[PDB]
Design a binder for this molecule. Structure first.
Ligand SMILES: [Mg+2]
Ligand SMILES: [Mg+2]
Ligand SMILES: [Mg+2]
Ligand SMILES: [Mg+2]
Lengths: 246, 248
DNA sequence: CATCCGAATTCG
DNA sequence: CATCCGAATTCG
């Protein structure tokens, strides 16, 4: 009666120490052994690495132009049924919504990920993309459990500007009472991969789910351990979440 | 019967061709002979020049640190009564509100000018300053006619963001039906003093007046400072605004 | 003695 | 092969 998953922007666009960082991401995958992994900022060579070092995950992608998202499904645990790609017609960064329908146990899921439009200056487009995601979450068949997990790039004000989440969609971190230990998934004071001398902190990485049949049990940051090469696996922390279906 | 005035950011911060440009500004003052002139971005030497080349105007200033505003009063037409400076506590650019009470044509006026906080990213402070100005315009007794004219640096929606003009305060341009001939007072297409390649057009320079019972009615609004000087540059990067109003 | 537009870029 | 924060600066 459970699903566990990681969502993680793994910064494929950072060319520094990629082999070692991919190894570290694959270490987290082996150690935490989630059913599903949502990845953003993947690049082709990174896929090839996951194919050898996380071989028990099926990699589902849509378009692979430049950098992209992927959903990884644990073989034997998760059965793929179908995929759907929802475009963001006004994106300037090749962003979109990747949806995968799966079965895990006797439970049907619609798993979605995206990397929403980046940077402060593209707030209006990022908000339009969010609304597109939220609308698609609501369209899913009543019997299916919908989970979105991704790099939303959202900051102060924006979700409110959007009019807030609909009454049957919830943010897992909010649902769990806004625990302080995972309140930031991108934090330049704690993570120095970008060498930014300022301390800025954001909750860019978020999980939304439609529902009280679905109950988040835990949420934790992963990728917190600096690698021997002196770099974190990514500039983002990953999020590990377990949900119970009641 | 009337009042005429010019408001003009004369770009004292542009150090090139200042003497010819000052000569150009003084030419406009002689030719249009306004009762009052509201100037922004004045610098000390520029004041010195006006005292010689527009010597029939009394120059009224508040603080003179760096660059500043001034209000010029035509000697014999306008009688100075008093001045008041209202500070903008959160300014990072030494901006403030300069108010001068005067008598003109047997009528009493409170004339105000300011150079509101500059640049796009200082919208919040600029809006707070606008509120301060608009609030100050309501304080004078109804008998006194209140006129604000200055470089407001305002752009799209900022006035709405502020709650809009109160019901007894009007923008002279809007009042006159938004005439296209003087819409933009800062225009990089038509004015090349900053040599900006792009075409940006703004209405930074604005005139607000308090009416109530229609005792003050704008008659005309025109751009001044449109004539290129011998050096192939204009007096300022802004056009000035010449306005005439009837006291009814 | 300088600033000013604003999209792109730099740099802390 | 790159991006990414955000204030400050560059340059069209
Ligand atoms: Mg990145
Ligand atoms: Mg200037
Ligand atoms: Mg600037
Ligand atoms: Mg940037």
């Amino acid at each position: 009666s459970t699903i566990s998953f990681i969502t993680w922007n793994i910064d494929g666009l950072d060319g520094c120490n990629l082999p070692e960082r991919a190894r570290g991401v694959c270490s987290c995958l082996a150690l935490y052994s989630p059913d599903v992994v949502f990845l953003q900022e993947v690049i082709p060579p990174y896929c090839a690495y996951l194919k050898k070092r996380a071989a028990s995950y099926t990699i589902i992608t849509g378009n692979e132009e430049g950098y992209f998202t992927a959903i990884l499904l644990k073989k034997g645990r998760v059965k793929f049924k179908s995929q759907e790609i929802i475009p963001f017609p006004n994106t300037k960064m090749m962003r979109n919504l990747l949806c995968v329908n799966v079965s895990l146990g006797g439970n049907e899921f619609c798993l979605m990920t995206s990397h929403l439009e980046s940077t402060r200056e593209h707030s209006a487009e990022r908000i339009r993309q969010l609304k597109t995601v939220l609308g698609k979450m609501q369209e899913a068949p009543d019997s299916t459990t919908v989970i979105f997990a991704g790099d939303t790039n959202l900051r102060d004000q924006e979700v409110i500007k959007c009019g807030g989440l609909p009454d049957n969609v919830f943010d897992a971190w909010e649902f769990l009472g806004k625990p302080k230990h995972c309140q930031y998934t991108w934090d330049t004071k704690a993570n120095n991969n970008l060498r930014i001398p300022a301390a800025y902190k954001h909750r860019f990485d978020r999980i939304f789910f439609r529902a009280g049949h679905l109950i988040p049990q835990s949420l934790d940051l992963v990728g917190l351990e600096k690698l021997d090469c002196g770099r974190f696996p990514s500039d983002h922390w990953g999020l590990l979440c377990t949900l119970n279906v009641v």
